[PDB]
Structure 1
Amino acid sequence: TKKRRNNGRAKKGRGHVQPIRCTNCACCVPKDKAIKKFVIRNIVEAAAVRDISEVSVFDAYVLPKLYVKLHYCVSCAIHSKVVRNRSREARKDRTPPPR
């Protein structure tokens, strides 16, 4: 019997897909049967920025962001708590944690 209806994210109306790799575990996994995670983060983060904003002169520019589209495989994504175990009732929801 099926423990996941969509099997970790579906591939219906599509006959095959290419595999994506993990960005920290490098292992082959389907692209839409695996976790996909957008990462928008400041270039100077919450760390550097405090002295970088005070020391800056002749500048007026809002901070850059780094954009990277991470892909995680299932085993790594559970492990480091990108996703984590939930109730079987809760599984039927496609609604995820807000960002």
Structure 2
Amino acid sequence: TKKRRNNGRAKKGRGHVQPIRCTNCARCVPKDKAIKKFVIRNIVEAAAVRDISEASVFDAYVLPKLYVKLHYCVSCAIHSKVVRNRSREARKDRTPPPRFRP
């Protein structure tokens, strides 16, 4: 049975997509098939925002951020619990989970 009309990948008008390497296990994954994370992490933990601010020689010092783009094979993605198996109906929706802004 065909589990996904997408076939698991965003390949639609192509014949070939250049592979990438999983950032967790170095598996060759097609670029479309790979689960992608883009994490904008503050370069300090949320608990060190105070001790750094006091030791900083600059008063109004905005603190730098870390920009890393992660690529996961689905094997690593599920094991690391970034994506989760969903019900047959719930597999369809493509909207991302909410940011939980409140």
TM-score under structure 2 length normalisation:
0.87
Aligned length: 98
Instruction: Give CA-to-partner distance per residue, 1:48-99, whole Å, 9 cap, x none.
Output: 322101222333221111101110111010111110111110111111212x
Matches within 5 A, 1:45-84: 45-84=45-84
Runs of at least 4 residues of structure 1 off by over 3 A? none
Task: Determine what percentage of the aligned residue pairs are the same residue.
Answer: 98
Residue 39 of structure 1 and its aligned partner are, at CA, apart by 0.9
Q: Secondary structure at the match of 1:87?
A: coil
Q: Is 1:25–1:76's contact at 8 Å kept on the other side of the alignment?
A: yes
Encode CA deviations 1:28-55: one digit per residue, 9 max, x unaligned. Answer: 1101011011011011131432210122
Alpha-carbon distance in 1 for matches of 2:94, 2:42: 29
Larger mean Cα displacement after TM superposition, 56-65 or 22-31? 56-65
Query: Higher relative CO (CA 8 A, sep ≥ 6), structure 1 or 2?
Result: 1
Give the alignment's Cα RMSD to 1 decimal.
Answer: 1.3
What displacement does 1:13 show?
Answer: 0.8
Distance in 2, matches of 1:87 and 1:58, equals: 52
Structure 1 residue runs without a partner (length 5+): none
Q: Which has the higher helix share?
A: 1
